Amino acid sequence: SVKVFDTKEVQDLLKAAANLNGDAGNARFRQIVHRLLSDLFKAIDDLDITPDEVWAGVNYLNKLGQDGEAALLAAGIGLEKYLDIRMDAADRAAGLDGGTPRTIEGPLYVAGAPVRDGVAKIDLDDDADAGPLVIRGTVTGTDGKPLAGALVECWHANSKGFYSHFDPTGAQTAFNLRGAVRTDANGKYEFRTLMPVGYGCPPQGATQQLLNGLGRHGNRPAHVHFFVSGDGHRKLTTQFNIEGDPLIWDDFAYATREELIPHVVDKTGGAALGMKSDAYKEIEFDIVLTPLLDGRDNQVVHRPRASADA
Amino acid sequence: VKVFDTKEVQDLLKAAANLNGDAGNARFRQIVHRLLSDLFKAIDDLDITPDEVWAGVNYLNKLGQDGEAALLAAGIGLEKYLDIRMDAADRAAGLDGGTPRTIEGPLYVAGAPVRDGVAKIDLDDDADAGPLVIRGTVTGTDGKPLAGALVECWHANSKGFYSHFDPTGAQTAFNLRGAVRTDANGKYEFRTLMPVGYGCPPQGATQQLLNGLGRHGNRPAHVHFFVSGDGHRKLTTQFNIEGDPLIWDDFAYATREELIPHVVDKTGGAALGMKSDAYKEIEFDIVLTPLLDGRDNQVVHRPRASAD
Ligand SMILES: [Ca+2]
Ligand SMILES: [Ca+2]
Ligand SMILES: [Ca+2]
Ligand SMILES: [Ca+2]
Ligand SMILES: [Ca+2]
Ligand SMILES: [Ca+2]
Ligand SMILES: [Ca+2]
Ligand SMILES: [Cl-]
Ligand SMILES: [Cl-]
Ligand SMILES: [Zn+2]
Ligand SMILES: [Zn+2]
What we know:
The PDB classes it as hydrolase. Chain A is of the alpha/beta class.
């Protein structure tokens, strides 16, 4: 095995490829590209990665983007969780760690859902195998005062593990199991929905192909996603997990947190609330938001996100 | 903040790569763990933000949707780097005298018809490209001509486009692509038209990254070759058209000084079946390296297009 990485020829090639000695441009982008390319070249040298192996990796990247699954792989190999770990460490150093814990967004948010005052019913399609579920709570600041007019958004899967706008078996109604609620004067929000089921990666897709290569499964336990925002506060990205799911501590995207597994309560009286059975489940999920530091939210994330019209 | 060295992060990497899993593909897990660890460390060291990361994730979607991962591999020098490591291995083994290798590029098409000695490979009219004869002798490093060696070439038209990859309309199958078996004296000949340099698809992922770096995505005019023969390794090489202003500024870093032959002006082209009496001739002799104990330690298997 040869070792060439630390030769002038290779180091000059990397400088040229990243255009380090180029005219005034995007120095930050060039710095990132040079670092990533240098690390890749060094890894090839150290592990003696063969051309056949490299071209197989190149081919996988083609499949990954052809499948549109780069963000699913980002969750599956722990990169999305890692970003949360770094955000959590920064919050702890700054004293901005007093709110409800964050966890990963995942790749399935859809913008444009209808907004209701106080209460929203979000199961637009019938799903005989999912039972009714009420999610409710109060949004407060870290000082405990209720936040009125805060925006609570949630999205989750049906009983087959599919989300509206991403269902391969057939179109769901737009924004099925997706809603937004403006909290009332006392900070309260409530969703009436159906119970989600966990799901697995598309089995022929690039993410499952790599997981199979590693010997890992690509399943998530049942969960519900939230964004919560409000004037004067940071935007929270979080979720909760459904108690009792066998995969709850074996999520392929490493997203479960012990503080985000709320007690599920058995209730009756569902028909009066517009649910399809007398018996239903209720999950209380309170939210504590952190005030902005210096008037700016330095952890809100901009990424490509789907959108639709109601 | 710096979190890379923490137990939480190192445990996450071990789980993500399944290092502690049942017996499996140990080599694949090793590579994945190394690449993931390096990525995580780079994010920590350079304080790469979530917004930046998700832009990079979005780029990977576009790269694969465009089918351009191998074009990017050329443009950021990874393909040249693979050649650098192969060259270092050959030097350490004491090999010299062979025609230098250079990059394959991503545009080979398998299945071209094989002709004896001479092949006319310009099937489509191209008014702006003049006639070109490429000819030469294939030998081994002992200087002896190799008879029945397989010489393959492919190159672009006057618009910079290759058959099977032309966005402006399908070319005839195997236009400007051919394969010849050398004659008893090692000789091969292609009758073709003069290539012009290739450029990246302007709206594609490779050119988008290059624009962000402030780089061009252009290649000087060149002709690709595969050359193979009994008792010898398979050679991947090319030559460049002398005098091209980009000859030492290839965005894929492929030029080598021994692969720039002289171009000669000739007459008599009609008798050779060329479209005009005046034509250009390039004599490109090729020297193959022998096998080692029957083995070829540098032939590359990668996905390649095909046609009939
Ligand atoms: Ca390193
Ligand atoms: Ca209904
Ligand atoms: Ca197993
Ligand atoms: Ca109703
Ligand atoms: Ca010698
Ligand atoms: Ca013709
Ligand atoms: Ca045409
Ligand atoms: Cl998700
Ligand atoms: Cl090429
Ligand atoms: Zn989800
Ligand atoms: Zn080419």
